[PDB]
Design goal:
The chain is an alpha+beta fold and 67 residues long. The chain has one domain. The termini are close together. It is classed as hydrolase inhibitor.
Amino acid sequence: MTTFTSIVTTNPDFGGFEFYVEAGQQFDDSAYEEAYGVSVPSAVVEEMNAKAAQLKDGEWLNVSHEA
């Protein structure tokens, strides 16, 4: 089991590596597995998706994981 963290901020750059869910955008848990090489549970993903639903234009959600 790994710990996932997120915050409400909107400044996703291309210079570094960061994944953000666009408002109304479904979070791709499959990509995280290949993008982080780790298993992402649907329970964690739905919460991120829910946040995106409440996210307004010009806003982005930060999705990440730890150990």
